[PDB]
Design an enzyme around this catalytic site. Structure first.
Site, PDB file in Angstrom:
ATOM      1  N   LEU A  26     105.862 -35.782  18.201  1.00 20.02           N
ATOM      2  CA  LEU A  26     104.550 -35.344  17.729  1.00 20.02           C
ATOM      3  C   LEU A  26     104.531 -33.925  17.177  1.00 20.02           C
ATOM      4  O   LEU A  26     103.747 -33.608  16.280  1.00 20.02           O
ATOM      5  CB  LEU A  26     103.564 -35.442  18.880  1.00 20.02           C
ATOM      6  N   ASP A  27     105.400 -33.086  17.729  1.00 15.07           N
ATOM      7  CA  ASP A  27     105.543 -31.682  17.352  1.00 15.07           C
ATOM      8  C   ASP A  27     104.291 -30.849  17.635  1.00 15.07           C
ATOM      9  O   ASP A  27     103.184 -31.373  17.774  1.00 15.07           O
ATOM     10  CB  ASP A  27     105.919 -31.546  15.879  1.00 15.07           C
ATOM     11  N   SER A  28     104.486 -29.536  17.701  1.00 14.72           N
ATOM     12  CA  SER A  28     103.464 -28.625  18.184  1.00 14.72           C
ATOM     13  C   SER A  28     102.216 -28.611  17.325  1.00 14.72           C
ATOM     14  O   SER A  28     101.111 -28.484  17.841  1.00 14.72           O
ATOM     15  CB  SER A  28     104.021 -27.209  18.261  1.00 14.72           C
TER      16      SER A  28
END
Lengths: 151, 457, 594, 43, 34, 81
Positions: free
Chosen positions: F37-39
């Protein structure tokens, strides 16, 4: 501080003020997606020296649009009630003062409480030795892990 | 002469009292003698009351006398836990200072000869010095002693010579006849120095803005029993004397009032302004005290009868309220030894009733109706306004700042979070509540019957 | 006679009961609501004896302190104003009682809260009734300090404290003027009594009226003094409803109302009163157009109403000026209480922008807020009309400065404006408050409260406009657009504000113009008039006064001087040495001189 | 609501009375004394 | 703990009233008769 | 309020997010090492999630986050359930 978390907080921030403008869940959703679309469509990857300049741009572009007052949840430092209840949160040691005619009326709670206080006064030297142990001369970090008791 | 003997008589009683009972002795009998003092209050609507050849009791003196008799028990109640570990002989020595002191007051209020009045006026200086110097905390008290001292004497000594002079240039020095035989002194240059000679001591003892420096530095130091007297009374007596000697002077006062009216009208706003930013409470109160005394001193100098009415009222009211704030601050200082106001923080959270006394006390400090403080102040604003229509613009600013800092001392040392680690506080003794209830109740009953406090005019 | 004094004095008793153990009981407050209930029931009677026969009374039961010449004494004049006003206060405050029992029902120390309520109201009664001017001053200042105790109720958060201090500060600034006047009447008229002062002052008073005007500006939050009132919303809602809606702030002009004939003596007083009351209507209403708190909006509203009625005094029509208050209380108490229902319902979220669109979620509150908004708007036969129309019309047909009348027009437009803003965001939209919905309109006492205020809110305009003797003497001729103007300006308000608000609904991000940032920064006024003078003073009080002026020179000039000179002299005379030839030869020359 | 009537009547006698009383006892100041009221009357 | 305060009030009220009653009643009896 | 109510409402929000595939979601399911999903989306899921409660998340605590259990733990602490 470090660069990544920096740009991130700028993102949550700008996004929130952006809701504060867009009001309706609708329009806000649209412009939100447009916004993240801006952050990726721009330099989602790049060399740093350009990137900081991109931030210096972004900060200005935000600061101009930051809105006279954002929505703020009551618990938050703005708050409609940031400390409404600080009138009440009496520290525990103060009860330890009631004198016996009051202390008799909650035998159970006081019992459990001396159990605790005992637990602490028994415990303390261990946190002393451990803190003394894990610590170097004494760096930036706060607290240290439990290893066998108390922490 | 009836009230004055027993006041002497407590001393043998003190010394002969059983070693652990003395506080009760001195307390009980001081209360009784207060009630006896109260019968004096009657006065007369015309002639000033008289007694022996050597005493008299003007209406101006009586409420003050009642007050002065009233304070001793209070100082006892405050003191008697502040000290405990002290040796019996030393304690027994200690209350003697207090009572000896009030004895000098009961003598120096009823006067009658202004030389007798003077010699007692200056005789008061010793016991209060001893108390400030031996039982004050921290080092500075030593130095403080000196400031308290010379500023009185440097003022008082010329007054002394001046007094002697008059009883040579005229007949008797006695007050009644000089009230009647009074004749104007006028301009020249010798007469002007006569004027300052007969004013400067009185204007030192109640601090004037250019000269008040000793007063805060006394209050910072003195053990509370010294504080209550040094604030509530001695200032006021300097005012009493200055109201006395103004029977002479005139018309010259019309010409010499101006400089002191400038130091006062400006010094009030000024000192009140300094009052708005103190580091520590015990001083904050002191500057509030000067900030109110300036009003008394202009009230005396404009010499309009309204101004003397307001003079009397404000003297008494400020007496009680100031003493009240002092004991009420010492309580914190004992509970936490902080002195600095910032450490107290959320004191209301941990205990309530003291917050109530903070409320009442500060509330009457700012003076709101119908506190005798207020009504005392409004008159002198009236007469001042008659004296100069501009003057209101100054008085109004006072009534601004005296609000602020007053509420300030409330909201900074109370409302807000408790400090976390300060476990020292221990839930309010009976004597504390008893004490400040004793300050504040008379102050509120007293509003019902001003007509007995307004004084001779 | 016995009647009015009873309709005051019984209010005192519960406070007395405050030391009795019943106070410590949970049971106490309902005795208070009942107490005000009986107080009202009793309170109607004097008004009716006042009705058909029209008699009025003054009593001064006990002189308090007989000075020379002057002998001030407490004296309860019971004129038209003082008789008419009491039932209103008792009425709305009784509704506030019933409301507060629910708004605070969780809260500890609630009993103390009610104690402070009654303690406030009684001072208000002290102010409305008092004849003798000094007694008006005790009512004045005492109401001020009650405002301080209630604003700071949630004493924990600092903002409450700053708000409280702020309010006491501006009130005090007004109090300076009050004292100036109060002295001047004594020095000149020799009085402190409305009989004396009304009698002896046929001559023009060039100055007392202006300081008294400043005092009137104090409580009333004119333009120079507005901000504390918006900041006073920080106290818990029933409080702000209690008095910042009506019972407190209106008194500031009530004072000026009491002294109409003296105003009539001058031209410049009516002048400047108008001159400022208008511009405060406008300048407040503009900020009212664009806020996000419910309560801030309602606050700016109430102050704007106050400016309007202030020109109503300044237009030389005091009677209607008083008339407007009696209507105004119902409206504003309605708004703050329904708003209290919303806020409590949602776990307290004042901000409209995440206030839901809950037109159906709380239908009764909806109804209430609607009649309320229409009343404030000035609908043609609803209660707000009987004030507002007569007012602005009278302003039209009067000789006066016109630019101010223009300001009255834009202001009465903006009334409709913000009043539609709050409706729009409060109800119409698809809801956008955070999910879970604890919403629960139900709790019968609240219902009964809002009910009673609606009842007054619709009948009182007609009933009271009918019953009062025709002191107004009506102006009813030229022209026709005269009467229409009050409506058309409103209609322009709804059309512009609503079409604008719908245009906000169409995507397209924009960024604010300068006017937006202005009017939504409350006119910038707090952020400049607070961060500036306070800095120059608090700096000055240390940069100078505390320091160099009095800790470093005033001590240098005479302690440190002498103390130094004796250092020099003492080391000079006692020169330690002691060689004989020295001073012995000195004996010689001192003989040669001698 | 009238007045400027019988109240004018009392207002007159008050005018005379307050006039003379103002005269007899004005700028005497505090420590007012008969010798001074004399000293004024001769003036 | 709220004990100490309530105790204080119990005391103070008790004394002020202790002497309070005889006085008030004495004043009333003096009013109705003499 | 109760812990089950917290874990339930939390997942009940994580389910609706598109990028997560609902079957793969688990209370202990990790957020980066599992799920990509990443930050930049993490900020979305966290602010959108606190928004459900009206609760406010301090930023440095927002940095940790990751495991949903860590989240339910976090609200469990702040609400003191």
């Amino acid at each position: 501080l470090t660069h990544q978390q920096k740009v991130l907080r700028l993102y949550k921030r700008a996004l929130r003020h952006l809701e504060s403008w867009c009001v309706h869940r609708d329009k806000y959703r649209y412009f939100a997606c447009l916004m993240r679309a801006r952050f990726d469509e721009h330099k989602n990857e790049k060399d740093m020296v350009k990137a900081t300049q991109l931030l210096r741009q972004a900060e200005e572009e935000f600061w101009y649009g930051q809105h006279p007052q954002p929505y703020i949840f009551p618990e938050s430092p703005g708050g409609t009630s940031y400390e409404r209840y600080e009138c009440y949160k009496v520290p525990e040691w103060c009860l330890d003062d009631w004198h016996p005619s009051e202390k008799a009326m909650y035998p159970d709670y006081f019992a459990k409480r001396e159990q605790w206080k005992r637990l602490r006064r028994e415990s303390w030297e261990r946190e002393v030795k451990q803190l003394q142990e894990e610590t170097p001369p004494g760096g930036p970090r706060t607290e240290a892990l439990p290893p066998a008791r108390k922490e | 002469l009836k009230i004055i003997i027993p006041t002497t008589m407590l001393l043998p009683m003190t010394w002969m009292s059983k070693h652990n009972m003395i506080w009760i002795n001195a307390t009980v009998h001081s209360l009784l003698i207060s009630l006896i003092s109260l019968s004096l209050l009657n006065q007369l609507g015309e002639n000033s009351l008289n007694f022996s050849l050597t005493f008299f009791s003007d209406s101006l003196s009586a409420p003050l006398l009642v007050l002065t008799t009233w304070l001793l028990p209070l100082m006892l109640m405050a003191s008697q836990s502040h000290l405990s570990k002290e040796t019996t002989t030393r304690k027994k020595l200690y209350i003697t200072m207090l009572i000896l002191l009030q004895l000098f007051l009961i003598m120096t209020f009823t006067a009658t000869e202004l030389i007798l009045f003077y010699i007692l006026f200056e005789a008061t200086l010793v016991p209060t010095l001893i108390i400030i110097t031996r039982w004050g905390n921290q080092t500075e008290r030593l130095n403080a002693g000196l400031y308290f001292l010379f500023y009185t004497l440097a003022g008082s000594l010329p007054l002394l010579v001046a007094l002697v002079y008059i009883q040579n240039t005229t007949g008797s020095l006695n007050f009644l006849i000089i009230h009647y035989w009074s004749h104007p002194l006028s301009n020249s240059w010798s007469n002007i120095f006569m004027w300052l000679a007969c004013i400067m001591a009185f204007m030192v003892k109640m601090p004037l803005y250019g000269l008040h420096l000793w007063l805060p530095k006394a209050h910072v130091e003195a053990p509370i029993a010294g504080s209550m007297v040094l604030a509530a009374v001695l200032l006021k007596l300097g005012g009493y004397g200055m109201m006395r000697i103004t029977t002479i002077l005139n018309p010259l006062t019309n010409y010499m009032a101006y400089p002191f009216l400038m130091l006062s009208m400006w010094g009030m706003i000024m000192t009140s302004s300094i009052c708005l930013r103190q580091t520590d409470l015990k001083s904050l109160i002191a500057y509030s005290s000067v900030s109110h005394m300036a009003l008394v001193i202009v009230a005396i100098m404009i010499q309009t009868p309204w101004s003397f009415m307001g003079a009397t009222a404000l003297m008494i009211a400020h007496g009680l309220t100031s003493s009240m704030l002092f004991c009420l601050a010492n309580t914190n200082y004992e509970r936490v030894h902080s002195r600095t106001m910032i450490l107290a923080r959320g004191l209301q959270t941990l205990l309530p009733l003291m917050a109530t006394w903070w409320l009442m006390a500060s509330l009457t400090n700012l003076a709101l109706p119908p506190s005798i403080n207020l009504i005392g102040e409004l008159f002198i604003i009236t007469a001042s306004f008659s004296w100069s229509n501009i003057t209101i613009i100054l008085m109004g600013m006072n009534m601004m700042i005296t609000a602020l800092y007053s509420l300030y001392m409330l909201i900074t040392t109370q409302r807000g979070k408790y400090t976390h680690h300060i476990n020292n506080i221990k839930a309010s003794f009976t004597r504390e509540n008893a004490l400040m209830a004793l300050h504040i109740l008379p102050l509120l009953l007293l509003t019902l019957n001003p007509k007995m406090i307004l004084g001779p005019l | 006679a016995s009647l009015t004094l009873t309709t005051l004095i019984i209010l005192t008793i519960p406070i007395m009961m405050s030391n009795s153990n019943i106070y410590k009981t949970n049971l106490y407050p309902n005795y208070v609501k009942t107490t005000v209930s009986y107080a009202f029931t009793l309170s109607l009677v004097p008004l009716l004896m006042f009705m058909h026969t029209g008699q009025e009374m003054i009593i001064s039961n006990w002189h308090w302190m007989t000075l020379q010449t002057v002998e001030l004494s407490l004296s309860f004049k019971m004129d038209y104003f003082s008789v008419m006003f009491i039932p209103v206060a008792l009425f709305v405050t009784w509704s506030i009682m019933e409301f507060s029992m629910w708004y605070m029902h969780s809260d500890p120390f609630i009993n103390r809260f009610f104690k402070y309520l009654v303690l406030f109201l009684i001072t208000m009664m002290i102010l409305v009734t008092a004849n003798n001017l000094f007694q008006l001053f005790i009512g004045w200042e005492g109401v001020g300090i009650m405002s301080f105790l209630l604003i700071g109720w949630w004493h924990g958060r600092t903002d409450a404290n700053t708000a409280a201090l702020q309010a006491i500060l501006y009130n005090r600034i007004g109090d300076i003027g009050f004292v100036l006047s109060m002295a001047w009447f004594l020095t000149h008229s020799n009085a402190w009594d409305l009989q004396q002062i009304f009698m002896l002052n046929n001559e023009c008073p060039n100055m007392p009226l202006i300081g008294l005007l400043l005092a009137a500006a104090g409580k009333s939050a004119q333009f120079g003094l507005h901000p504390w009132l918006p900041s006073a919303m920080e106290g818990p809602t029933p409080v702000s409803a209690l008095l910042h809606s009506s019972t407190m702030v209106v008194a500031g002009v009530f004072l000026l109302i009491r002294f109409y004939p003296l105003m009539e003596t001058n031209k410049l007083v009516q002048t400047m009163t108008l001159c400022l009351g208008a511009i405060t209507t406008l300048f407040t209403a503009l900020c009212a157009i664009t806020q996000n708190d419910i309560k801030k909006i309602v606050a700016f509203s109430t102050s704007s109403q106050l400016g309007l009625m202030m020109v109503t005094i300044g237009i030389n029509q005091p009677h209607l000026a008083f008339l407007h208050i009696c209507m105004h209380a119902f409206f504003k108490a309605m708004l703050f209480m329904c708003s209290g229902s919303i806020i409590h319902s949602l776990n307290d979220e004042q901000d409209i922008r995440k206030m839901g669109g809950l037109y159906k979620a709380m239908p009764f509150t909806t109804t209430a807020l609607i009649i309320g908004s229409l009343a404030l708007t000035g609908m043609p036969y609803l209660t707000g009309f009987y004030s507002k129309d007569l007012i602005i019309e009278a302003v039209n047909m009067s000789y006066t400065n016109a630019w101010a009348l223009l300001m009255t027009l834009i202001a009465t437009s903006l009334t409709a404006a913000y009043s539609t803003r709050i409706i729009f965001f409060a109800f119409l939209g698809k809801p956008r408050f955070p999910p879970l919905v604890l919403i629960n309109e139900n709790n019968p006492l609240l219902i009964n409260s809002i009910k009673r205020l609606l009842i007054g809110s619709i009948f009182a305009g007609f009933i009271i406009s009918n019953n009062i003797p025709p002191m107004t003497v009506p102006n009813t001729t030229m022209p026709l657009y005269m009467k229409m103007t009050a409506l058309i300006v409103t209609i322009m308000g709804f059309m512009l504000a609503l079409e604008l608000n719908n245009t906000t609904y169409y995507l397209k991000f924009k960024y604010p113009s300068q006017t937006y940032k202005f009017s939504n920064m409350l006119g910038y006024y707090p952020s400049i008039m607070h961060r500036l003078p306070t800095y120059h003073n608090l700096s000055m009080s240390q940069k100078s006064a505390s320091s160099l002026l009095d800790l470093i020179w005033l001590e240098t000039i005479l302690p440190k001087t002498t103390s130094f000179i004796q250092m020099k002299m003492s080391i000079m005379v006692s020169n330690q040495k002691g060689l004989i030839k020295l001073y012995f030869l000195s004996f010689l020359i001192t003989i040669m001189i001698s | 609501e009238s007045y400027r009537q019988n109240c004018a009547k009392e207002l007159e006698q008050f005018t005379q009375v307050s006039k003379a009383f103002q005269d007899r006892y004005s700028d005497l100041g505090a420590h007012y004394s008969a010798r001074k009221c004399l000293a004024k009357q001769k003036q | 703990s709220g004990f100490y305060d309530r105790r204080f009030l119990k005391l103070m009220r008790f004394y002020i009233l202790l002497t309070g009653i005889p006085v008030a009643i004495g004043i009333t009896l003096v009013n109705v008769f003499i | 309020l109760t812990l089950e109510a917290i874990k339930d409402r939390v997942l009940y929000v994580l389910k609706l997010y598109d990028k997560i595939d609902p079957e793969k979601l688990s209370v202990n399911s990790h957020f980066m090492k599992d799920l990509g999903l990443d930050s930049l989306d993490q900020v979305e899921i966290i602010m959108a999630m606190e928004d459900e409660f009206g609760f406010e998340i301090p930023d440095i605590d927002a940095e940790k986050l990751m495991c949903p259990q860590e989240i339910v733990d976090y609200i469990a602490d702040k609400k003191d359930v």
